[PDB]
């Protein structure tokens, strides 16, 4: 799949344009569904997938919390497209052997679980607060067939192998289970545009 | 609109099935879009709308954070449907004159904003933890054209006029902006033994 990026939709669509902006040069592979987009990467028909993840006003985005780790994928980038509604996307590859070399400008997406008791999330976030680490996304998910715990996806500033994030995530681990890095990637300059 | 419930999708869809489960004997009103679904309730073509909100495995749901309050709607119920995957839905009406009467067995859905600074969410959740209040959903959203604050949706056990939630919500108002009760409704028996 070298230099192919899959997206959900048709040629010329906004998602196609997003691919062409985010990954110049690359050949885009239109797919009808989210599952097909992830399959193309899993199966080697494409190197990357472009997945819508947030909208500022309106939209339906795929829920990736289960499917993306099941497919063995990993987030290597983000993209913002302002159409105003702003659509944010994740860019995902097959899982790399190593994380990017640490330095400035990174963000991290992770998954973790906490139990369904008051203050459970709060205890897991305490290290981040004390370390002065800024989060930028947090979303809860039901567990199938259970209400005794909740899964979370979190986007957070920094790189997991560097301060200040590393020590803060050590504390999150103390008060959660099933901690998994779903991506490490450069934060878009869109976030700092005047 | 009396005894009519609108949903997004084609007839026969899982949302249609959810309507038949949740409101037996009601007439269902298929709508192509999310905007059309909420408009039907706003405009009086339907008394309720069935809106998908979460999936345990996978799915696409409408993002309600902006359009639902704009349409003057209020969440009066929840529903769960098992299809390997569980889909949860909100059931929304035109905003009532008064909240439901305080009593046992309620949950509350709210919106609020916090600043994009470390520990801002953590400070807002401290009161709920101190009060022994259990949350069951939390989801962040982007504000259009600003990265200085983040919008949240929260589902929490209790009724806003009854302890322990009442005092906790009062505290939350000193740690957030634009705090809004979006719904107060019975917790489904699906969370216990249905
Ligand atoms: N950035 C703020 C608010 C926030 C929390 C979590 C997700 C998104 C925003 C914080 O880290 O507390
Ligand atoms: N119920 C736990 C975990 C949780 C937090 C937020 C949303 C969903 C679950 C708490 O209140 O801390």
Numbering used by the authors:
A (entry chain A), B (entry chain B): 3 to 85, 171 to 281
Paper text:
GqqA strongly interfered with N-acyl-homoserine lactone (AHL) quorum sensing signals from Gram-negative bacteria and affected biofilm formation in its native host strain Komagataeibacter europaeus. ESI–MS–MS data showed unambiguously that GqqA hydrolyzes the amide bond of the acyl side-chain of AHL molecules, but not the lactone ring. Consistent with this observation the protein sequence does not carry a conserved Zn2+ binding motif, known to be essential for metal-dependent lactonases, but in fact harboring the typical periplasmatic binding protein domain (PBP domain), acting as catalytic domain. Structural data together with a phylogenetic analysis and the enzymatic characteristics implied that GqqA represents the first example of a till now unknown, third and novel subclass of acylases.
We report structural details for the native structure at 2.5 Å resolution and for a truncated GqqA structure at 1.7 Å. Crystals of GqqA and SeGqqA grew applying seeding within 3 days and belong to the space group P21 (GqqA) and P212121 (SeGqqA), respectively. Therefore, the crystal structure of SeGqqA was solved by single-wavelength anomalous diffraction (SAD) and refined to 1.7 Å resolution. The coordinates of the solved and refined structure of SeGqqA were suitable to solve the phase problem of native GqqA data by molecular replacement. The loss of this domain, which obviously appeared by proteolysis during the crystallization process of SeGqqA, resulted in crystals with different space group and cell dimensions, compared to GqqA. However, the obtained crystals were of higher quality. Due to the fold of the polypeptide chain in GqqA the missing domain for SeGqqA is located entirely at one side of the protein and has only a few interactions with the other domains. Superposition of the native GqqA on SeGqqA main chain atoms resulted in a Cα rms deviation of 0.76 Å, indicating that the missing domain of the SeGqqA structure did not change the overall fold of remaining two protein domains.
